[PDB]
Design a protein around this ligand. Structure first.
Ligand SMILES: *[C@@H]1O[C@H](CO[C@@H]2O[C@@H](C)[C@@H](O)[C@@H](O)[C@@H]2O)[C@@H](O[C@@H]2O[C@H](CO)[C@@H](O[C@@H]3O[C@H](CO)[C@@H](O)[C@H](O)[C@@H]3O)[C@H](O)[C@H]2NC(C)=O)[C@H](O)[C@H]1NC(C)=O
Lengths: 222, 213
């Protein structure tokens, strides 16, 4: 049960500082080299640096050697990335990864923690349920929508019926405009399940401590 | 600092095909090259290390070869679930740089989109803004044209489109087209239409509603 879990990502001011951490479990962290990598939006993976078990050897990609610091606390099974002098080029998903025994290859990667370098302010989304057109739908199936408008920064998480509704979902990538993102998600279910049974979209925006659910019902006076 | 030039950048293949990706190192990296697979929304997984060795549990489909500066990665029989970005890395010397990645795209049969149009939410118009949403779902291939029509006339400003990645299950794409109006502008007109021109048909798919309905 090898596991890595990054945390500490979020919004940071250009020129500012931010500390990432990565909790290791399911293996003896103190025996392994650890590394950090990052993936900017739309770009490829970029290796950040590595550190050996005893912290005696720490290496960085040159662009980052004077602004990022890697450390580890073996007593806590935790790997750290101290980011400083950050700019928009540092906006990325940051991954911690373990080197395999006897190889400089990253045999397990964490899920990543998102970092945004920006002057723009955190803004919660408005969330809107999208019911079908007013006419009672013909056909065996129904498509519903959830619109998530005007939040900053990324990301938002959107589920349907607390995630117990996973099939027939499409969550469309956020689009950024005027330092505000908009995203939507469609769910298609059989007309035998809606509207006779409830469907809700669950929207969480961690950066604004926001958690908004919207039940979707047919349009019309109530 | 060593550059890993990975080719091709994009790759369109059908299930069953042999594919070969190439990584060219700007100077020798001995045998010390790993290959990774990164599916949409997932972290990378190690497939190949020291250029030619499958990591534990990696299926026989995946192989690698090379030494010095020329390295290849091969999927002998491409399967739908192999939809992902594949990238190399040299680990001979720090910095242990990655290649630029190869985006693998799965060829499937052509499918027309299922189109659904949505009036502005009951809950939105109070805010003074009005978003008209058109979902175009489960179509192939990716390219598609969405035309918005207000009362019969075309509208180009205020439209924003967003595509999903290829679904790993059915290899289709989905797209949302969002027309953003003010409440006041939304209320000036009655007929709202989104037209989906896709190569699967000469005839556009048309979904429409009237605001006072
Ligand atoms: C990011 O983390 C650094 C490093 O701190 C260490 O590493 C982290 C990953 C965690 O494990 C920490 O628990 C751990 O200590 C933080 O740097 C620390 O900042 C404080 C100030 O906030 C420093 O204290 C000062 O020290 C000077 C002496 O040089 C005194 O004059 C000051 O009065 C004050 O006491 C501390 O020394 C410093 N530690 C190191 C090792 O540099 C940093 O604050 C943190 N950044 C963010 C944004 O969270």
């Amino acid at each position: 049960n090898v596991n890595l879990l990054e945390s500490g990502g979020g919004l940071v001011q250009p020129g500012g500082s931010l500390n990432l951490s990565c909790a290791a479990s399911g293996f003896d962290f103190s025996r392994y080299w650890m590394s950090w990598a990052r993936q900017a939006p739309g770009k490829g993976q970029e290796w950040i640096g590595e550190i050996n078990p005893g912290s005696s050897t720490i290496k960085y990609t040159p662009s980052l050697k004077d602004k990022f610091i890697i450390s580890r606390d073996n007593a806590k099974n935790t790997l750290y990335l101290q980011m400083s002098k950050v700019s928009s080029e540092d906006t990325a998903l940051y991954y911690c990864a373990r080197y395999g025994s006897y190889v400089y290859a990253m045999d397990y990667w964490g899920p990543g923690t998102s970092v945004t370098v920006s002057s723009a302010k955190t803004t919660a989304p408005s969330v809107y349920p999208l019911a079908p057109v007013c006419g009672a739908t013909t056909g065996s199936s129904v498509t519903l929508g959830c619109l998530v408008k005007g939040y900053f920064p990324e990301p938002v998480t959107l589920t349907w019926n607390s995630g117990s509704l996973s099939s027939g979902v499409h969550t469309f990538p956020a689009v950024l405009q005027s330092d505000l993102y908009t995203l939507s998600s469609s769910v298609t279910v059989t007309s035998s399940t809606w509207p006779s049974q409830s469907i809700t979209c669950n929207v969480a925006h961690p950066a604004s401590s926001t958690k908004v659910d919207k039940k979707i019902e047919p349009r019309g006076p109530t | 600092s060593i550059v890993m030039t990975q080719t091709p950048k994009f790759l369109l293949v059908s299930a069953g095909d042999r594919i070969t990706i190439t990584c060219k190192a700007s100077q020798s990296v001995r045998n010390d090259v790993a290959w990774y697979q990164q599916k949409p929304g997932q972290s990378p997984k190690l497939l190949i290390y020291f250029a030619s060795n499958r990591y534990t549990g990696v299926p026989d489909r995946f192989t690698g070869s090379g030494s010095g500066t020329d390295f290849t990665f091969t999927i002998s029989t491409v399967q739908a679930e192999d939809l992902a970005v594949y990238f190399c890395q040299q680990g001979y010397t720090s910095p242990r740089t990655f290649g630029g990645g190869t985006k693998l795209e799965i060829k499937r049969a052509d499918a027309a989109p299922t189109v659904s149009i949505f009036p502005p939410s009951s809950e939105q118009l109070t805010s003074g803004g009005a978003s008209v949403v058109c979902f175009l779902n489960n179509f192939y291939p990716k390219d598609i044209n969405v035309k918005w029509k207000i009362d019969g006339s075309e509208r180009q400003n205020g439209v924003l489109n967003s595509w999903t990645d290829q679904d790993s299950k059915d290899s289709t794409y989905s797209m949302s087209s969002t027309l953003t109006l003010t409440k006041d502008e939304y209320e000036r007109h009655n007929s709202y239409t989104c037209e989906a021109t896709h190569k699967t048909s000469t005839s556009p798919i048309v979904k429409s509603f009237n605001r006072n309905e």
